Each structure stands twice: as structure tokens, then as C-alpha cells.
Amino acid sequence: TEPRVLVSEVLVRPQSGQLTPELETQVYNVIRTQPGRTTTRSQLQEDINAIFGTGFFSNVQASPEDTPLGVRVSFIVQPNPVLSKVEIQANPGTNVPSVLPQATADEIFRAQYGKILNLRDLQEGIKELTKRYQDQGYVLANVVGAPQVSENGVVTLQVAEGVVENISVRFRNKEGQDVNEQGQPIRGRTQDYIITREVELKPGQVFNRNTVQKDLQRVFGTGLFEDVNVSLDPGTDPTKVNVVVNVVERSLEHHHH
């Protein structure tokens, strides 16, 4: 149980600078603190979050001051700067450049340029971005952390694109298992090299499922296996991935059909 108090007045102020009439309105749309209604700290916290959630602010505060008619609650808000540009920072810190053209950030975010940074609109664009990656089969591609915002108005998106750390080969049976029905570990009559030399993917490249599927087709093209697929594990470095090429060796019966 926490104290409940009657609200006297509500005001909305800039923390610093001035506050456009439009932002002021944004704040009054989403708050529920109201002259004549009681509030508690919890309800003020809910209003602060509603304010953040509009997307236009970098800090938000509620300062209440006691008066004979009740508390006068001031929401003190700091608007976001205007968006100069959205910068994409690929595969940090690794020498792997973006697998993506540089006109991409600007292609996606520009219609937002020269205006107050709205984290709602930013995220709708990050959504278009991650879709560029996937459309090109970079299926692991992923914005990491939260967007960093400069006084200048420059958003830095970190993107972990799917850098591969290790590739290995694992033999199973048709059933999916890696021990035989007597508990012995399955291993290969085929040397690892016969598989990996058919695979273009290497540690240090960004995982691409179209490229990797072609690799799998090419391993399969050797005639040596019944099944070929790839599976992924998170890396020792968790930004990265480990790739496993899983292979079911061809039975003498399978060669006969």
C-alpha cells in the first residue's frame, strides 16, 4: 500500500529549450493524471511510460508539488533531436563489412530526415531493414542493442549480420541420431574434407541461407549421401554462429533404390 493524493493542476514543460505545441499535445493525449482525480506514484510511473512510448522523448519526469487544493503535477520532458542521418554499423567489432550496400540506411530512413526523431518510426524502418537482409537470405541478420542517438541527430544501428565462427561436419543415421542402436557414436567412412571442399562458406563470412543451400546441393551432388542439411549453434562469441553440416551416409541398399 502506497499514498494516494488528489491532483490540483497538470503542467507540461521542456527540461531544456522550448516545446512545440504539437509535442505538448502528444503528452496530453497519453497521460491520465487529471485535475480532480487522485493519483499515486504508480499511476504517475504508468504516465511517464506512456509518454516515452509516443516516441518523441529521450527523458521524462514527473515532479509533483503539494498545494492546499492538491498536488500540481509537472511532466518535464526532453524531446529527441531532429534526425540528421541513420548510420548502419555492420558486424562490430570484426573486419566483416556489411553484406549490404551503403545507400541502404538512407534508402530506408530518409523520408524521416530533417525532423524530430520518433523511435516508433525508427523501428518501423528497422523492420524494413531486417527485411532487406532476409529477402537476400541473410536470415540471421539482427539489430543489436538499442539505437544510439547523438546531439547532432545521428542514429547508429549496430547490425550483427550472421558471421560464422566455425564450420564442422557431423554424421548421423536416417533416424536423426548420432549413436547407433547399440550406443556407439556414428562417425564417417567419408573424410570431412570431402564434404567441406564442396562448401564455399568459410569462418569469417556472413551466413546466407541461399548460398549455404547451394553448398548443400553441391555436397549432395557427390552421390555419397542420403541426406544433407545444415544446423546452427550459437557461437563462443554469441553474436556469431557455428555451422554444422549434418550428413547421412549412403547405404549399399540406397545405391540400388
Side-chain angles (χ1 to χ4, degrees), residues 88-157:
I88 290 176
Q89 210 259 226
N91 318 301
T94 60
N95 315 330
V96 193
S98 187
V99 190
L100 231 51
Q102 204 141 325
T104 314
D106 305 350
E107 268 158 50
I108 277 162
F109 293 100
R110 71 161 54 95
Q112 284 174 49
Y113 285 162
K115 266 196 267 178
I116 185 179
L117 173 58
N118 187 329
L119 307 189
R120 256 41 206 181
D121 293 328
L122 196 67
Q123 275 291 153
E124 216 55 33
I126 285 186
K127 209 193 143 166
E128 248 147 336
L129 174 59
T130 72
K131 200 205 170 223
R132 295 314 180 62
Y133 281 103
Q134 290 153 24
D135 277 351
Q136 292 219 64
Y138 297 99
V139 286
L140 287 169
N142 201 234
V143 183
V144 149
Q148 269 24 228
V149 212
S150 70
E151 338 185 355
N152 286 189
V154 72
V155 182
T156 312
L157 302 180

Side-chain angles (χ1 to χ4, degrees), residues 34-54:
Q34 247 200 0
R37 295 294 180 272
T38 57
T39 200
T40 47
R41 181 189 202 248
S42 292
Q43 294 164 284
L44 288 182
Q45 261 304 324
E46 281 153 51
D47 269 2
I48 289 178
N49 302 342
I51 292 158
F52 270 127
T54 59

Side-chain angles (χ1 to χ4, degrees), residues 30-90:
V30 300
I31 69 192
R32 275 163 192 185
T33 296
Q34 247 200 0
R37 295 294 180 272
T38 57
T39 200
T40 47
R41 181 189 202 248
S42 292
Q43 294 164 284
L44 288 182
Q45 261 304 324
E46 281 153 51
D47 269 2
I48 289 178
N49 302 342
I51 292 158
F52 270 127
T54 59
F56 305 95
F57 309 97
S58 94
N59 202 17
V60 171
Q61 273 173 68
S63 191
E65 98 180 64
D66 289 306
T67 82
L69 291 195
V71 294
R72 85 158 60 84
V73 175
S74 292
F75 293 105
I76 296 163
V77 304
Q78 179 69 100
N80 288 317
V82 325
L83 195 52
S84 350
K85 68 166 14 268
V86 177
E87 217 181 43
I88 290 176
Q89 210 259 226

